[PDB]
Design an enzyme around this catalytic site. Structure first.
Site, mmCIF file in Angstrom:
data_model
loop_
_atom_site.group_PDB
_atom_site.id
_atom_site.type_symbol
_atom_site.label_atom_id
_atom_site.label_comp_id
_atom_site.label_asym_id
_atom_site.label_seq_id
_atom_site.Cartn_x
_atom_site.Cartn_y
_atom_site.Cartn_z
ATOM 1 N N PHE D 32 0.844 -1.212 0.000
ATOM 2 C CA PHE D 32 0.000 0.000 0.000
ATOM 3 C C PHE D 32 0.880 1.264 0.000
ATOM 4 O O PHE D 32 1.891 1.313 0.711
ATOM 5 C CB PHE D 32 -0.966 -0.051 1.211
ATOM 6 C CG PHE D 32 -1.722 1.236 1.496
ATOM 7 C CD1 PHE D 32 -1.097 2.296 2.146
ATOM 8 C CD2 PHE D 32 -3.084 1.354 1.201
ATOM 9 C CE1 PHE D 32 -1.787 3.463 2.443
ATOM 10 C CE2 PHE D 32 -3.776 2.524 1.490
ATOM 11 C CZ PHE D 32 -3.127 3.576 2.115
ATOM 12 N N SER D 98 4.994 -5.943 2.483
ATOM 13 C CA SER D 98 4.058 -5.201 3.345
ATOM 14 C C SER D 98 2.652 -5.859 3.270
ATOM 15 O O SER D 98 2.495 -7.038 3.614
ATOM 16 C CB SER D 98 4.081 -3.698 2.973
ATOM 17 O OG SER D 98 3.389 -2.881 3.909
#
Lengths: 441, 441, 441, 441, 91
Positions: D32, D98
């Site tokens: 993100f 992530s």
């Protein structure tokens, strides 16, 4: 996602569109030189408030195709028509901002309001921006528009900068209402539109919408920012409301042209209140229809009176203790178990809060289709079809092609959370079943 | 109901049979000159005790066909074989009375004990009624049997009268143990058998079953009346038990040949403690069969230990607060929601006391299947087939031809009471779905 | 003959039935522990009187299957439903004796009276045999029924003996009303029913039929023997008639429970008269419909008044001098010749006595289809179809697909005795023609 | 390129993906608010190292569709599943960064590791970011995440600025590790993701992956930057490695969250070594597969032993004097000339050091095919198809539709450098021809 | 709009193109590292002058596919060939 609206030489003309949420369809038509994504602050609110949000990018803008043809309001309105017909939109709300308000007027005017429940005009072009002898209230002379075209052709990139300045009243609003980053995004969006469309767009701005206005059939909202530097409220919104007195009319105090972002709040609140009113009216229209179908299965008497009253109260939003409601239903004499199941189903569907109540055995037993595999087979087939429905009437229509046994089983499937459909489609299903049962009596 | 076992000239040979109750299958094989209906006192008890009761009429008797062929124990055993294979009986108990004990020995001996859990011999022919040099314990000489044949051929009707006299010890038991009406029914049943079968049957009585006995593989019960005038306990049961020491052995004090009626409670009692035990033993096996499948899905660890223990406790009838059980399951970390649903389903099915607990949302969500109509379609198709199943294996087998997704949805259908099936079939479904899931890991 | 009503394990559940005679269908439902054959004295009379006689054996009795399931009045009524639907019985009379009266009430109550013209209750269970606080008129306490079950389970064979004693009042009627041989047949029939059904049946006897009775829609007959030892007339028939005052009600003086045999006469005579009345009532219902169609063709005025009066009088059965009637018609001014032919036709069809009157030229000329071969061709085609019709509505329906010219010719064909159809079908034809003609005006 | 993963209202949900290089498939799952293109530094290295690189844009990001539904790890994992199944990926490596590390855990956990050779976790969410009573090591309280959502909704554009600050440790790394232009690109990428997805994404970050971790079946790599301000190494990577001790574990000294760019080197080097290990294992598997097919052609005996040993040695990289190898093969007695050609072909293909050895006449003669033009025609047709193949299986599969003669000739074409194909496709060809030959014996 | 020029692994190679105006076809081929849109000042003039304007994005640029293959003038010329043949451009 794309909708094809035409052909240019060897290539088709495709409009970029998005289709979010569930409920009453609301179609947002963006302004120059932005895209469907500029509505993001409004879309979020509408989604939360329970509407189906449709956005699209006008030809030459955002992610749509960039032809060098069709830059005029009849084409733009025809483009919109194709979208509405492609999606089979019923009972739709059309919301236009700036340029978008031209689509709304011209579509309504030419194509009529058969699919259209209400319209809204935000930072409007209307009624006629061109200042002439016969149009004294016009905002500017022809030479002025000729100027913008010339400016865009010279350097559209540089042009966007000065444009967003006035568009947003950045001298007032920067670092306050609008961030530098938000403005950066807008410039990027504009720079991404087609070169030809950029220069061609300003020629459509002084379109005469004066003969379109008397055609506006349905409830309308007019909304303008009093600090609008781009479309002077005095040559637009104020003379527009004279032409359409009937329109609901909202002035946003000191709001600029780009009021969708800077004053999203004031914008969303006006829109949402009006939309809420419309939604309540729809519930009354759907709730009262549902109620008549539901009542048609109950034998006449004092019990039928109690039930009707209870329906009306839950429909009017008095949050009822579902547990208490269901027990009452369960213990009613004379009521058929099947009728109890149908009412049981309706109450859990309409009641504001189920409060984590487990599903009821009496309803499950009533709506099981006799445990018949053939009924269940047909119920599954119906469910498949209902999954594709979005309207009460479409849902009710296909349901009527199935037997009462298959219909009741289908209701059970939904009640048991084995399948899922939208509330309005569920309503159509229950009403088809009620109609079938009542008709047998 | 009929099962076709062969052909005689232009006509087929059909056996009359009945198929009652649910649970472990118990096959009752009648004596001469009676029918499957002669077991009525035993059938009622077995039905109450929770067994599946199968009766049939031997060729030439009761409501079966009356050929003039196949009156011998290999044919009779082949007839029985056809019945067992036709019904796909698994884990069956074979109970023979008098003539019927010949079927039991010869079938076990020739065809083996693959479908057979236990056997019982009541008022047995075994081991060899013919009195010879090599068979000293034989009950009578050949000339004696030749005599019976001659007597039946002369007047079978009159013959039945004197036969039931000694069959029932009527001089002792009439108006006491057996009514005149009960005896009348027996004569009527006999008079209704085929003329040819009546005279041919007595030739099968001195069949040498001596080489069949060592083949008896499975637990056996031997039961005889000490007042048996038809089959002297001393030439039959007593020498039979010497040949099969392992057999459980019960003498009914002063009971006649026709002890099924006169001492129904006697033989019935010494039987229930047998059929009931078999049912409990079958549950123990079938129980471990479900538990092993269920556990195969759970990751190894301390949680898997707790679950196993809980399963075992519920299965042993000890654990029972379903509400507490379901909450525990619901709140278990690491456990897959799907595995929680399967266990949830199993516990509600096996727990004796469901009480008034509503079905659980966590299970419903786990089993429903995401609402894909194709998946639901297949689950409904499977359900249709499962509705026709009565056994764990048959159920499990058809279930294995469906995908894990369709299987889970099918489980949801049943869990939601949208369809209904027997516990043993439900077990088969669960185990197929567990197998499929485990196999995917 | 068999009708399959369900499935038990591997076997289907089949009901033995018979289907004799021609005419209005009369369905006879036997009592415990007998079969359809117990109606033989009644069947013979009905056959002679010109009815279609349907009998069947309740599940567990006579020649029907002997399951260990479905021993309750909803199943029994569902069984009956399957029979009625299987045979497509229209306008049927339902006659129940003893247990059979439970079927009649429960079927009528649940399934309604669409196929049903009249009902009859002989030696009734109604309204509720169980003696409770809320049911004071009940014949016995629960403990009493529990007793019968226990007695049947102990020795059903012996039980039947004492049962037929009181069933027939043998202490009064043996060697008088009933022979020893007739009683022997009854015991044999009972002994032939299923063991399980025998013990299960008595539990259905204290079914509460109190809510079924208000549902009885159609003309009813209640008939009871005052010497009934099995169903005390005071706890049954007498309180039943209070609940259904409208019922025609017949007490058979000193008649026992088994009054079908002992008092067949008194039974048949009451039944036959009631049966005769039912047909007359149906004819009365048909006549007003015919009259309205017939009158629709006549111009309004005093003549129309005279005709209507004449129709009504012949319909009400005042035997009219057809000769006088026909001459009057013939000499009527203003009346169209075609209308005169139609009325001429109707009067000869409805008038009790034609008295050997030759057919009338004026009618023949009126109904000849203009002597057109095409009309006549179509009239013959219609006739072919009408030959297969048995109802007024079916007849009228197919007739409406033909032209008025073909219809009139068809009427002529029948009038001239060139073809023949039933009166009710003839009525349908004349009414279709009247409708067509009236519609043209 | 797009893969459709579902439907939203009238529009489908499509994922943007790319598919580059040849060899073992490596699937990169972005973080993100970035896209598949953020892996560009890693992709280049993997491409150079000889892997097949698959990237895709998570729903709501980069060039994928922007629905307002399905923002949760089960959907994200289902999305990934669709990609893997759509492309029929076998023996794949899953690499998450992530947010992407959530997909890796949840997919492995739910769907299992059938297609999956190894996994890698870079700047991981794991095991559970939410700080609770039961999760003490959690990085933040719920109120903290609620805050981010609120911040993104307020002005996502402005938000991205402060986010990339800490994402990249710009106060340390700007003008050093990361350029201002590289950061500008990142902001542009983020601004291009969907408004709804931006605000919805942060709610998925405190997903509890604790029960997913024990499911990790295959070799894993955990890699984290010690200067990570976004995902504190102490609440993530360090407690994650405790939960998965078996994982290979790499700390990047003073590396920020955005270590893919700032420390691409250290990243690529760790990744490539781990990948090389996995690749070697894959090569060994392929060799075993190739070896088994190759050996299936050779008659059993001591020679077959020598050959197998030689294959294994060349495959393990140990054997390498091709000239010596080929002479040995050439001079082998008993070996078929055709089998010698196949082995000859395999050895020249697998041996690392071909050196400057001319192609061998004995192989050429063995593979050429007798010079039949029909045979040669088919070999050329196969070659055309093989040229389009990139996998062993795809190659082997199409080859099996050709005759052994055409297959051998095709091998000759490649051997003679008349056509060219990738090693893995060449392997497939060889194995198809071996299979065909062996199957003929 | 796209024209497919080849295949890379599981994916096709598509060129983004535009097709504007009427009259004699004029095909504009952009430079590095830009796209067909870089011709916008020229396209407007040509459109006004009465030509049919065709632009496309070279593989790896603008809105075209981004393969890791075919970066050479024979491929680039073959790409162009496919465009010309696809549109049946004459004169």
């Amino acid at each position: 996602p794309f909708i094809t609206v035409g052909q240019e030489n060897s290539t088709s003309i495709d409009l970029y569109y998005e289709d979010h949420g569930t409920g009453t369809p609301v179609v947002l038509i963006h302004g120059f030189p932005l895209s469907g994504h500029s509505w993001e602050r409004q879309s979020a609110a509408l989604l939360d408030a329970g509407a189906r949000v449709i956005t699209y990018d006008r030809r030459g803008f955002g992610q749509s195709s960039q032809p060098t043809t069709g830059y005029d309001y009849d084409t733009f309105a025809a483009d919109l028509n194709t979208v509405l017909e492609t999606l089979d939109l019923q009972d739709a709300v059309l919301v236009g901002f700036s340029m978008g308000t031209g689509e709304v007027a011209r579509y309504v005017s030419s194509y009529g309001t058969a699919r259209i429940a209400a319209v809204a005009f935000l930072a409007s072009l209307e009624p006629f921006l061109l200042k002439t002898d016969d149009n004294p209230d016009g905002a500017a002379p022809q030479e002025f528009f000729d100027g913008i075209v010339a400016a865009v052709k010279a350097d559209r990139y540089a042009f966007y900068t000065g444009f967003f300045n006035d568009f947003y009243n950045l001298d007032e609003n920067l670092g306050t209402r609008i961030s530098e980053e938000a403005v950066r995004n807008s410039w990027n969006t504009a720079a991404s539109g087609g070169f030809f469309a950029a220069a061609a767009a300003p020629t459509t701005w002084y379109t005469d919408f004066r003969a379109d206005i008397p055609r506006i059939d349905v409830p309308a909202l007019i909304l303008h920012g009093t600090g609008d530097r781009t479309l002077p409220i005095e040559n637009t919104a104020r003379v527009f409301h004279k032409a359409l007195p009937s329109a609901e009319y909202v002035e946003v105090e000191g709001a600029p042209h780009g009021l969708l972002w800077t004053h999203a709040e004031e914008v969303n609140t006006a829109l949402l209140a009006f939309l809420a009113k419309a939604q309540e009216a729809q519930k009354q229209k759907l709730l009262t229809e549902v109620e008549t179908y539901v009542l048609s299965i109950i034998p006449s008497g004092p019990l039928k009176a109690e039930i009707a009253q209870r329906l009306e109260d839950v429909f009017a939003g008095k949050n009822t203790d579902l547990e208490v409601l269901m027990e009452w239903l369960k213990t009613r004499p004379i009521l058929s178990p099947l009728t109890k199941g149908i009412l049981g189903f309706v109450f859990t569907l309409t009641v504001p809060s189920e409060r984590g109540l487990q599903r009821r055995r009496f309803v499950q037993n009533a709506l099981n289709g006799n445990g018949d595999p053939n009924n269940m087979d047909k119920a599954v087939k119906l469910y498949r079809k209902l999954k594709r429905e979005i309207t009460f009437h479409g849902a009710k229509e296909i349901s009527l092609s199935y037997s009462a046994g298959a219909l009741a089983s289908c209701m059970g499937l939904i009640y048991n959370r084995m399948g899922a459909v939208t509330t309005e489609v569920a309503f159509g299903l229950v009403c088809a079943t009620c109609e079938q049962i009542a008709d047998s009596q």
